Amino acid sequence: VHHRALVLAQIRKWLDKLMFKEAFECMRKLRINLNLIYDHNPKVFLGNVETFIKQIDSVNHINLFFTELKEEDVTKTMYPAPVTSSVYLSRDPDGNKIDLVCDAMRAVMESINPHKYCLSILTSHVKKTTPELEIVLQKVHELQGNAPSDPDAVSAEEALKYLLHLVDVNELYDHSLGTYDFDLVLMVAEKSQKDPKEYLPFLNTLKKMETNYQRFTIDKYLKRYEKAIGHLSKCGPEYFPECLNLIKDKNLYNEALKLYSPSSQQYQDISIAYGEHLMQEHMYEPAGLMFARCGAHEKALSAFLTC
Amino acid sequence: SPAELMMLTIGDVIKQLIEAHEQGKDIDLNKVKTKTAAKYGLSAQPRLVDIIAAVPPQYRKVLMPKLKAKPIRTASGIAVVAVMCKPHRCPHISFTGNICVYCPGGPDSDFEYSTQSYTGYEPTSMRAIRARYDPFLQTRHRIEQLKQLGHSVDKVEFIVMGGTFMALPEEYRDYFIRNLHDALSGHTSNNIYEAVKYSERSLTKCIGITIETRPDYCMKRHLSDMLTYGCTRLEIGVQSVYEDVARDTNRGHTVKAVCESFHLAKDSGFKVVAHMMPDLPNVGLERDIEQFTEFFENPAFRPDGLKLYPTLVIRGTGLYELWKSGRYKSYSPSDLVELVARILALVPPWTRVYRVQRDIPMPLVSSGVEHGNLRELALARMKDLGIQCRDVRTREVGIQEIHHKVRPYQVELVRRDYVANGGWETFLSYEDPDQDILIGLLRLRKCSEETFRFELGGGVSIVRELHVYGSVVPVSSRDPTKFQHQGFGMLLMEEAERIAREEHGSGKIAVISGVGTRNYYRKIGYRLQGPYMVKMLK
Amino acid sequence: RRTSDPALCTLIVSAAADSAVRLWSKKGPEVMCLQTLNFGNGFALALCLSFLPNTDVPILACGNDDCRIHIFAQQNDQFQKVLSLCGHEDWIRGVEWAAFGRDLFLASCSQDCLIRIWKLYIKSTSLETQDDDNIRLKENTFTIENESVKIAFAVTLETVLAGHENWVNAVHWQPVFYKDGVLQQPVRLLSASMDKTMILWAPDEESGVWLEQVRVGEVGGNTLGFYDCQFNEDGSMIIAHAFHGALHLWKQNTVNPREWTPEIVISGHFDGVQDLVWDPEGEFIITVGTDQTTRLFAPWKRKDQSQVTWHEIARPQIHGYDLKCLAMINRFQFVSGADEKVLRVFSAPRNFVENFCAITGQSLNHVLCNQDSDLPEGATVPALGLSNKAVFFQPSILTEPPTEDHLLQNTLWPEVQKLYGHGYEIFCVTCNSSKTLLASACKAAKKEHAAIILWNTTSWKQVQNLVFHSLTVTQMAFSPNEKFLLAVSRDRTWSLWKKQDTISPEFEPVFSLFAFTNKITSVHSRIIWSCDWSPDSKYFFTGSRDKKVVVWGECDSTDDCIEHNIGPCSSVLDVGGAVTAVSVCPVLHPSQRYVVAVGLECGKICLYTWKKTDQVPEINDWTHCVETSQSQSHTLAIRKLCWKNCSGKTEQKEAEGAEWLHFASCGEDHTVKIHRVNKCAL
RNA sequence: GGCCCCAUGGUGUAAUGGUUAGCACUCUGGACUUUGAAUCCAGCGAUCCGAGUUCAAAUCUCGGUGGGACCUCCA
Ligand SMILES: CC(=O)SCCNC(=O)CCNC(=O)[C@H](O)C(C)(C)COP(=O)(O)OP(=O)(O)OC[C@H]1O[C@@H](n2cnc3c(N)ncnc32)[C@H](O)[C@@H]1OP(=O)(O)O
Ligand SMILES: C[C@H]1O[C@@H](n2cnc3c(N)ncnc32)[C@H](O)[C@@H]1O
Ligand code: MET
Ligand code: SF4
Ligand SMILES: [Mg+2]
Ligand SMILES: [Mg+2]
Ligand SMILES: [Mg+2]
Ligand SMILES: [Mg+2]
C-alpha cells in the first residue's frame, strides 16, 4: 500500500524545492489530482512558468494537464494540510484561475516554440471559460493553405482530427455557420457524412442575400433570437412587422425597447404590445403605469380600474 | 381497433420526446406514457422495445441514452454471445461403461434433441434448436437481439457450451471456429488462418473465446490447438477436492490430474475457471467448509474464477435412483443459505464469481434448490451476520452503480502478490479504498521452469489479463461520464513492464490477446510472434 | 484500344489473399505479368478497370479494408498512384465505373449501409473561370502526361444515398444496349443487401436527388439476405443470389411498368449429395445430401413445345441431422437414415399427388389407381423436436413448377413411423424386390456393434440379427431372385447369406451363412466400397480402393450344392484410381453382355463390357467400351450410380426401338446428372 | 329544456368525517458471462375541475364538464 501521508510529504518537499518533473511523474503514476501543483502555492507557480514548461517538455503531458484543470481548490476539499500553521494567504486570485493559467502558459509556449507546441495552444484556447472556437477554426484555416518551413509542423488533417476529437462534428458545423464564413462551413462539412445536394443549395441561397438579412436568417436558423432581432431591426421599415411578430412570439420586449430610442414610434408600438402582454398576465398596475408612460391613457384607465 | 391506437400512441410519444430534445429540456418518460395512453383510450401501456423500434434514424442515433433497456447487459465493459455445439457423447463413455452419476440429458435420454448436461428448455438451448445448431445463424440472431435492446456491440466475447468440445473431429472444430470468425468479420474463408487474418483486420473486435473442457483433454497438443483458435479462457469442472468423491461418482479422472492441468494451462498463459458442487453424496455439512477453506488456502488449487452449483436431483439419472431408495437427502433451505453465505465470505479479493446456481426450470427438479435468487438471499443473510463479500464482481463500478448508488472519489493503486500452481503471481489494480470500488485490473506471472512453448522459453514473463470495467465505450470514441477510455490501460502496462525487468529479471514480455487487442498492443509498441504479442525489454 | 491492328490485346487485374494485386497482359497465346502492388498487411476487396475520358490511358480503382478508395493511372508503362478518396468508414464491397457523355462516374457501396457516387471530369483550360460568386466543393486534382502534353483531371463527390439497414453486398450500373441501331444509355442503379431486399435507384430531373423506384424481396423469417444482383440486356429481367444458394428471378410487365413477378429458375443442393433412387415407374428421382435436405425432381410437360425439362417440385424433408441413406418402399413412401441411431419412414400427402399429376400431364384418377384412397393433406414443422405432423399445409393448386418460396414451406411430407434398435449412427440401407424386408447397418469398432438387422414392412419389428464382421458394413444388395443377401465391409471381407425354405404361410423365413471370406481368401487389399448383382442372380461384382473390380460367380444352383463353389471367376482390372461405385444394367442380351458402370474418386464414369471367357485362360474378359469426356465428368468423388430399372414397363411399348438407355449419377460436387447411352453400340 | 343518478392508478374495481387510499390486469428493475417474453423477489403509479359547511371532506350543500334514464323542443 502507498499510504497518502508519506506521498504527500514527499510531494510537498518536491514542490517547495522547484522540482516539478519528479512531482509530476509521481502524481501521474499514483493518480493524485494535478491541481495541487498550482493550489499549493499560486504565486510561485505563476512566477516560474518557464521552468515548468521546460521540465515537462511534452505535448501529451501538457494536454493531460489542461484536461484536468478546474476552478475548485483542492487544498480545501480533497487534501487539507495536516499542519494548520499556514504562513499566509495574501493575494486573492484576481480572476478566473483557468484564464490566468491558460494565458500564461500559452504566452510561454508561443515564445519558446510556435511549431513544436501546436495542438496544445489550440487546447489552451478551447479549454478557457468561454470556448473560442472561432479563433481555433481561423488558425486551422490559415494552416490549411500554407507550406512548412521547419520539419516539425503539423498537417492540417491532423489538426482537424484533433479538433474533431475535442468537439463534435455537428457542433462545429453550427459554430462555423455562426461565424458567417462559408469557407469554414465547407471545411467542417467535408468531414460531416452528409449529402452535398442537401446543403449546397441551402448555402447558395444564403449567399445571395443582403448582409443584415443574411445574418438574421442564419441566427434564426441557429436560435440566437436576440442577435436575429437586432440584425432584422438594422434593416428597412418593411421588415418591421416580421420583427414585431418575432418579438411577440419569444417575448423579447425589453431587448426591443433597448434597441430603439424612446422617441421612435416603434418604441411606442413595442410598449403597447408589452402592456397588452401584461394585460394577458394580470399585471394590471404595472402595464397601466407603462401605458401612462408611453401615452395609452385610456388603457391606463382600464388597467387601473381593473386592479 | 387497439392496434392503430397503439401505433398512434407510440408516434405521439416519440413526437414529444424529439420536440423536447429540439428545444432542449428534460422529460419524464413514465408520466408521458401514462398521459398519452389516457387520451386515445387504451387499457395497457407502451413497452420500451416498441418505442425503440420506431425512432427515425438520426434521432435513433441521438436519443438511445434515454430509452435503453436492461442496462446490466453491457455494464461490465463487453457484450457476451453464447453458442452451442452439436449433440455428442462424452469421451469417457467407452472405457468405463457409463457417465457421471448426476448429469442430465444427452444423446441417449428422454430429453429430445438436447445437448449433454442440458434439458433443451433453457434460453440458449431453444435458440440453437430452431437454428439447427448453426454457428452463423446463432451469432447473427443474438447480435440482432442485443442491438434491438439498444446496446452497443462494438466489443464481443464468445462462450462455447455443450459437452466436451475438444473431443470432436478436427474438421468440425475447424468449421465451427472459422464460421464464428466469419460471422463477426463478414468474410468467406476456407480454414482457420485466413479467418484469423481477416478478423484481425476487422472492425467488430473479437475479444476472446471461452471453452469448457475436461482435465484429461488439456495437454500440450490440445493447449496448442486452442492457442491457434484464438481462445483465451478455460472452464474445468473440479466439483470436489476429495479423492473418494471423484471415484464414487464415476468422474473418470483424479484430482492430481486436475492440479497438473492447472499448472500447464497457467504456464501456457490461459485463465482458469472452476466448477464446484456443494451437497455431493457422502459429503456432510462440515466437510464443505473444510473443502472450500483448503480450496482457497492451498497453493495447488487457487483458481481465478468460481462457479457454485448446488447439487440437483433430476429424473433419469443414478442419483435419482439413489434418492428414491431412501439413501440420499438434501439440505434444508435455511442450512443451504447459511452454507452459501459462509462460503461467499471466504473468497479472496482476486477471484471473480460468475454464477451462483443452475438454471433448470423448477418443475423438472425432484429435490434440491427451489427458489431462483439464491445470491441475493445469501447476501442479505451475510449482512445480517455482519460479514461482507469482497470478490471481483460485487466490487466493480457498474455493479456498485446499479445495485447501490456510489461513484469513485479517491482512486489509488493496489498490488497483491502470492504463489499459485508453482508460480509467482501478481495482481495489480486501480481502486477506491474507502468505498471499496474496483475500476481496472491486470494479472502478471513469471514463467516457471516447466514451460513447453517455444516463444516463452529463455526468460519470458507473460501477461494473462488486462481489463477496465464500466459501460462500453465504442472504439475511438470518448465519454466523460464513463470509465473506459481515460488512460487506465497504459498506466497498468507501464507498471507491468517495470516489474518484469527489475524484479523478475526477464528479458522479454509476452501477451496473449484477441484481435482488436492485437491492434491495441501494436499501437503500444509490441510486435507479433506466433500467437503472442511480444516485446523486448533489454 | 489501339491502332496497330493487334490480336485483340487484353488487360487483366486480379487481387488475392496474399495482400497483393497483380496485372497481366495477353497478346495472342502469350501472357506476361506487367506489375505487382503490395498493400502491406491490408487487402483489396473490389476492382474495376476503364479508360480516362477523351484519351486512351487505362485507369484503376481499388477498394480496400482501409475504408478508402485508391486510384491508379498508367502513364509510361507502369501504374502509379494518383489519388486517394475518403468518406467511407467501413469495409468496401464493390466499385464500378461508367461513362456518360464526356464524364466518368464511379459507384461505391460499403458495409456502412450507404452508397456513394463520385464524378471525374477534365479540368478547365486554366481560363474562363470568373464566377467566384458561388459555393462549390473543393476539387481533387491530378495531372498526367500524354504525348508530351500535360492534362489535368478533377474528381468530386456527387451524392450520398441511403435506405438500407444491413450490409450492402453489391452495386451495379445498367449496361448500354442498341435499339434499331441507336444506342440507348439509361441512368439506373441496382443494390442488394443482407436484410433480404433489393432496391432500384434512378435520379430525379426536377431536383438534385435520387429516389427509390422498386423495392423487391421478402422481409421476414430467419432466412438471411442476398449476395449478388444482376440486370438483363435491356432491363426486362432482374436476378439475385441468396444466402444458401437459391436463385430469384423477376420479370417486369409490359403494360404495367411498376409490377414485377417471379419466374422459374434452376435449383439444386448446396452441399454434397450422398444417395439417389429412381421412381419404380420412372418419372421422378429423390436425392439426399449433407445439407440436411431431401429433394424430388420430375419433368414438366408443356403443350406448345417439344423439349422436356426437369424441375424440382418437392422437398419432403428439412432435418436437423446430416442425411446418409435412403430407400424406396412404395410409389409414394420412402425410408431415410441420417446421422442418428433412428430410421424414419415418410409418406406422401394428398395435394402432392394432384400437383404431380397436373405437372407431369397424367390423369388424376389413373395415377391414384383407386388404391391410395383417403390420406392426410399435408405436413408442418412440429412445435418442439424433430418430426413431421399431418395438417388434416394450405391447399394450393399448381399448373407450373413452384418458386423458392412455395418450396420452402408448403411442400413437406408426414412422418408415419420410427424404428429403434441400433446403437450408433446409420450407414447403409437396402430393400428387396418383393417389397417385404429391410436391412440396416451402423458405424462400429468391435464385433458386437457391427451387426445387420432385418425388419418387416407390414408391422415394423426386428426379425433376426446377423452377427458377423468387426467393422462397418458399407453396402448390401438383394439378388433379383429374392434368395440372397450380400454384405461388404471395411475389414476387406464379405459374406453371403442364404434364405432357408419353409412353407409355413403364417411365419417368416430365415437366413444363415452360405459362404464367407477370411483374410487369406480376400483379394481386395483395402476397403471395399461397392457391390452389385448380375441381372440373372448368377454373379456379383465388387469394387474397392485397390483400384480393382472383381467378379465372384457361380452363386446359382440354389437347389442343392455340397457346401458351395464360390470363388474368383475373372481377372482383376487396374482401373487407374480408387473405385467408389459399381452398377450393372438390368437388360439381358443374347450375346451375353454384362456392362458395368464404374465410377472413380476423380469424377470419371467408365462403361466396360465383361464377357465370360468359358475357357481356362481369363484373358479377353475386360473390354473398354466408352468413357466420359472432360466436360461431362464430375470433379470430386462419385457416391452412387443407378440405371433406370423401369420394371413397371417390362417391355418398352412406346419407344423408338429402345435406342437409348438412361442412368443417373451424383457426387460430392453438389451436382446430380442424368446420362444417356446408345443401346446398339454396347 | 327541464327532469333522477353516475365520475378514484394506463384499465376492472375496495374504504365508515382522524391524526395520512387496499387489491387484480398492464409496466419497469435485479438474481443473469445460459434470458426483453419464463421463475422468484422487490418497485413506480389515483380520490376530475370550483366554491364551501363541520376542528376537521374522496365522503355532506350548491355549482360547471362528460355520461346514463323520460319526453324533448327543433327543424
Ligand atoms: C488483451 C486482452 O486480453 S483484452 C482487453 C480487455 N477487453 C476489452 O476490450 C474489455 C474492456 N477493455 C478495455 O477497457 C480496453 O479495450 C483496454 C483494456 C484494451 C484498454 O483500456 P483503456 O483504459 O480504455 O485504454 P486507454 O484509454 O489507455 O487507450 C484508449 C485508446 O485505445 C483504443 N482502443 C481501445 N480498445 C481498442 C481495441 N480493441 N482495438 C484498438 N484500439 C482500441 C481507443 O480507441 C483509444 O485510442 P485513441 O483514443 O487514441 O483513438
Ligand atoms: C455444466 C455443469 O453443471 C454442473 N452439473 C451437472 N449436473 C448437475 C446437477 N445434477 N446438479 C447441479 N449441477 C450439475 C456440473 O458442474 C457441470 O460441470
Ligand atoms: C459442460 S460440463 C463441464 C465441462 C466438462 N464436461 C467437464 O465435466 O469438466
Ligand atoms: S463430463 Fe460433464 S457433461 Fe459429460 S457427463 Fe460428466 S458432468 Fe455431464
Ligand atoms: Mg376508471
Ligand atoms: Mg366504489
Ligand atoms: Mg366509497
Ligand atoms: Mg421481467
PDB file of N, CA and C and ligand atoms in Angstrom, chain B residues 102-104 117-118 212 237 239 251 275-277 309-314 319 358, ligand 2:
ATOM      1  N   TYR B 102     -24.725 -37.914 -12.079  1.00  0.00           N
ATOM      2  CA  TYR B 102     -25.709 -36.865 -11.851  1.00  0.00           C
ATOM      3  C   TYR B 102     -25.969 -35.989 -13.071  1.00  0.00           C
ATOM      4  N   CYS B 103     -25.418 -36.312 -14.225  1.00  0.00           N
ATOM      5  CA  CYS B 103     -25.547 -35.411 -15.365  1.00  0.00           C
ATOM      6  C   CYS B 103     -26.843 -35.690 -16.118  1.00  0.00           C
ATOM      7  N   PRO B 104     -27.680 -34.680 -16.345  1.00  0.00           N
ATOM      8  CA  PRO B 104     -28.941 -34.891 -17.060  1.00  0.00           C
ATOM      9  C   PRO B 104     -28.821 -34.672 -18.560  1.00  0.00           C
ATOM     10  N   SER B 117     -25.773 -32.442 -20.397  1.00  0.00           N
ATOM     11  CA  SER B 117     -25.861 -31.542 -19.249  1.00  0.00           C
ATOM     12  C   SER B 117     -26.832 -30.393 -19.474  1.00  0.00           C
ATOM     13  N   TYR B 118     -27.794 -30.561 -20.378  1.00  0.00           N
ATOM     14  CA  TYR B 118     -28.827 -29.565 -20.612  1.00  0.00           C
ATOM     15  C   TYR B 118     -30.130 -30.276 -20.942  1.00  0.00           C
ATOM     16  N   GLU B 212     -15.135 -24.977 -22.581  1.00  0.00           N
ATOM     17  CA  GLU B 212     -15.257 -25.865 -21.434  1.00  0.00           C
ATOM     18  C   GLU B 212     -14.637 -27.212 -21.775  1.00  0.00           C
ATOM     19  N   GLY B 237     -14.288 -28.559 -14.678  1.00  0.00           N
ATOM     20  CA  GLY B 237     -15.119 -28.940 -13.554  1.00  0.00           C
ATOM     21  C   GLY B 237     -14.367 -29.735 -12.509  1.00  0.00           C
ATOM     22  N   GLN B 239     -15.368 -29.769  -9.006  1.00  0.00           N
ATOM     23  CA  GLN B 239     -16.526 -30.358  -8.260  1.00  0.00           C
ATOM     24  C   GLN B 239     -16.200 -30.777  -6.822  1.00  0.00           C
ATOM     25  N   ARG B 251     -16.456 -40.168 -12.039  1.00  0.00           N
ATOM     26  CA  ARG B 251     -15.992 -38.971 -12.732  1.00  0.00           C
ATOM     27  C   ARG B 251     -15.058 -39.323 -13.882  1.00  0.00           C
ATOM     28  N   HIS B 275     -15.570 -25.162 -11.856  1.00  0.00           N
ATOM     29  CA  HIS B 275     -16.907 -25.517 -11.400  1.00  0.00           C
ATOM     30  C   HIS B 275     -16.810 -26.347 -10.129  1.00  0.00           C
ATOM     31  N   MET B 276     -17.574 -25.955  -9.104  1.00  0.00           N
ATOM     32  CA  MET B 276     -17.622 -26.675  -7.838  1.00  0.00           C
ATOM     33  C   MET B 276     -19.070 -26.943  -7.454  1.00  0.00           C
ATOM     34  N   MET B 277     -19.295 -28.056  -6.761  1.00  0.00           N
ATOM     35  CA  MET B 277     -20.640 -28.521  -6.422  1.00  0.00           C
ATOM     36  C   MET B 277     -20.742 -28.863  -4.942  1.00  0.00           C
ATOM     37  N   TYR B 309     -22.431 -24.556  -7.965  1.00  0.00           N
ATOM     38  CA  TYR B 309     -23.588 -25.286  -8.475  1.00  0.00           C
ATOM     39  C   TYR B 309     -24.060 -26.275  -7.420  1.00  0.00           C
ATOM     40  N   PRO B 310     -24.984 -25.874  -6.549  1.00  0.00           N
ATOM     41  CA  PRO B 310     -25.545 -26.828  -5.589  1.00  0.00           C
ATOM     42  C   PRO B 310     -26.196 -28.000  -6.306  1.00  0.00           C
ATOM     43  N   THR B 311     -26.082 -29.180  -5.703  1.00  0.00           N
ATOM     44  CA  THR B 311     -26.487 -30.408  -6.372  1.00  0.00           C
ATOM     45  C   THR B 311     -28.000 -30.477  -6.533  1.00  0.00           C
ATOM     46  N   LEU B 312     -28.440 -30.813  -7.740  1.00  0.00           N
ATOM     47  CA  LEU B 312     -29.846 -31.004  -8.061  1.00  0.00           C
ATOM     48  C   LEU B 312     -30.068 -32.443  -8.498  1.00  0.00           C
ATOM     49  N   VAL B 313     -31.174 -33.034  -8.060  1.00  0.00           N
ATOM     50  CA  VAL B 313     -31.551 -34.381  -8.468  1.00  0.00           C
ATOM     51  C   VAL B 313     -32.597 -34.265  -9.569  1.00  0.00           C
ATOM     52  N   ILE B 314     -32.344 -34.935 -10.688  1.00  0.00           N
ATOM     53  CA  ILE B 314     -33.188 -34.856 -11.872  1.00  0.00           C
ATOM     54  C   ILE B 314     -33.497 -36.275 -12.325  1.00  0.00           C
ATOM     55  N   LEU B 319     -28.355 -40.741  -9.498  1.00  0.00           N
ATOM     56  CA  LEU B 319     -28.687 -40.053  -8.258  1.00  0.00           C
ATOM     57  C   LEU B 319     -30.186 -40.073  -7.999  1.00  0.00           C
ATOM     58  N   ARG B 358     -27.639 -23.189 -10.803  1.00  0.00           N
ATOM     59  CA  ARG B 358     -28.033 -23.624 -12.132  1.00  0.00           C
ATOM     60  C   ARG B 358     -29.315 -22.919 -12.563  1.00  0.00           C
TER      61      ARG B 358
HETATM   62  C1  LIG E   2     -22.297 -27.851 -16.647  1.00  0.00           C
HETATM   63  C2  LIG E   2     -22.031 -28.090 -15.183  1.00  0.00           C
HETATM   64  O1  LIG E   2     -23.250 -28.377 -14.499  1.00  0.00           O
HETATM   65  C3  LIG E   2     -22.959 -28.996 -13.292  1.00  0.00           C
HETATM   66  N1  LIG E   2     -23.926 -30.059 -13.055  1.00  0.00           N
HETATM   67  C4  LIG E   2     -24.073 -31.238 -13.724  1.00  0.00           C
HETATM   68  N2  LIG E   2     -25.038 -31.973 -13.258  1.00  0.00           N
HETATM   69  C5  LIG E   2     -25.556 -31.243 -12.227  1.00  0.00           C
HETATM   70  C6  LIG E   2     -26.605 -31.471 -11.322  1.00  0.00           C
HETATM   71  N3  LIG E   2     -27.345 -32.578 -11.342  1.00  0.00           N
HETATM   72  N4  LIG E   2     -26.862 -30.534 -10.412  1.00  0.00           N
HETATM   73  C7  LIG E   2     -26.123 -29.431 -10.395  1.00  0.00           C
HETATM   74  N5  LIG E   2     -25.119 -29.105 -11.185  1.00  0.00           N
HETATM   75  C8  LIG E   2     -24.879 -30.050 -12.085  1.00  0.00           C
HETATM   76  C9  LIG E   2     -21.538 -29.552 -13.393  1.00  0.00           C
HETATM   77  O2  LIG E   2     -20.742 -28.760 -12.560  1.00  0.00           O
HETATM   78  C10 LIG E   2     -21.193 -29.322 -14.858  1.00  0.00           C
HETATM   79  O3  LIG E   2     -19.820 -29.134 -14.993  1.00  0.00           O
END
